[PDB]
Amino acid sequence: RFHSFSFYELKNVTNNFDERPISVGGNKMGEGGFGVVYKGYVNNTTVAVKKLAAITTEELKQQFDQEIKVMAKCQHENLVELLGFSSDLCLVYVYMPNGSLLDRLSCLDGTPPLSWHMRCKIAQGAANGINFLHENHHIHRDIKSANILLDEAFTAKISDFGLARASTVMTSRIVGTTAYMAPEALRGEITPKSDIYSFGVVLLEIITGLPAVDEHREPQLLLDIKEEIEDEEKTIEDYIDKKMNDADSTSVEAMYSVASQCLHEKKNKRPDIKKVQQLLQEMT
Numbered sequence: 001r002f003h004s005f006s007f008y009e010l011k012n013v014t015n016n017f018d019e020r021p022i023s024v025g026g027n028k029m030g031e032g033g034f035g036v037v038y039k040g041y042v043n044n045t046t047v048a049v050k051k052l053a054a055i056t057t058e059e060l061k062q063q064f065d066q067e068i069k070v071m072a073k074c075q076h077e078n079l080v081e082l083l084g085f086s087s088d089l090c091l092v093y094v095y096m097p098n099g100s101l102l103d104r105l106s107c108l109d110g111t112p113p114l115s116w117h118m119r120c121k122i123a124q125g126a127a128n129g130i131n132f133l134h135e136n137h138h139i140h141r142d143i144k145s146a147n148i149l150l151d152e153a154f155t156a157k158i159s160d161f162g163l164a165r166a167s168t169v170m171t172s173r174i175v176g177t178t179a180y181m182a183p184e185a186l187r188g189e190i191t192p193k194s195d196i197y198s199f200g201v202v203l204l205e206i207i208t209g210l211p212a213v214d215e216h217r218e219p220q221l222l223l224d225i226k227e228e229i230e231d232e233e234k235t236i237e238d239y240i241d242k243k244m245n246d247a248d249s250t251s252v253e254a255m256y257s258v259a260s261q262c263l264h265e266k267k268n269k270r271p272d273i274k275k276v277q278q279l280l281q282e283m284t
């Protein structure tokens with residue numbers, strides 16, 4: 001199944017969890033909401049380790065459990081692969097050579113901008129992954145561009161299943177990234193339709209290249225830009241990412257239409273993941 005790695009083995013490959021950037025000689029490639037991630041070559045396998053960092057110490061460990069439990073039942077080309085763990089805190093995965101969709105849309109660390117054809121394939125790959133999760137009666141609850149990772153071929157892979165749940169119920173701990181969350185999820189509802197809403201936000205990020213939340217931007221919330229388009233003030237061509245030259249207006253408007261259906265405030269009128277798949281497949 002999974003390999004139980006040892007703590008010290010992870011420290012040696014991470015250069016003692018060197019939080020410095022790679023170009024400076026460290027190992028940190030990024031940080032999550034609940035942990036940090038470093039590169040570390042292990043048995044010639046380049047690997048990303050997730051030293052969790054808390055929201056008490058118990059809950060952080062139960063989410064450590066949930067990721068392992070979901071990753072054992074859900075293997076798919078559009079999901080990340082859990083290689084193993086270190087508990088005596090750490091979750092070991094196959095290193096994704098191209099990081100997160102969020103960082104690549106912002107061209108972080110100097111990576112070239114994504115073309116429209118890569119973005120369309122990434123969206124289809126991400127929807128294909130969410131479809132596999134929803135087919136197995138699992139809800140991600142944190143669909144966002146930072147949790148859509150990209151391999152050497154820019155194949156989209158959904159990651160971070162610590163918040164995942166079995167597949168409408170209510171909870172006492174509202175968790176997630178608010179800039180992506182559906183209104184019902186912000187109140188404590190758990191439904192796969194929230195995943196659809198959050199995927200619509202990612203589709204907006206893909207079209208525009210704008211992060212879902214930007215503190216130095218007006219509007220700060222990418223959702224607040226859809227309404228500015230909807231009330232006819234502007235159009236979606238005014239917000240197409242300018243860091244691409246292979247975008248056609250017919251396909252861009254098709255992905256926006258998918259995003260708009262996904263972003264319906266009322267959840268029951270949002271399409272399910274299978275319909276979102278079909279619409280994204282029709283676009284190409």
Ligand SMILES: CC(C)(O)[C@H](F)CNC(=O)c1cnc(-c2ccc3cc(C#N)cnn23)cc1N[C@]12CC[C@](O)(CC1)CC2
Nearest residue numbers: 029030031032037048093094095096097098099100159160
């Ligand atoms: C060369 C480049 C262009 O620099 C490139 F980017 C280098 N490769 C990476 O940076 C990078 C590589 N493999 C992963 C990876 C692989 C599996 C998992 C699982 C889980 C969870 N659960 C998180 N990560 N993960 C994450 C990575 N980077 C992140 C940066 C910001 C984040 O928020 C934390 C880590 C999301 C992705």
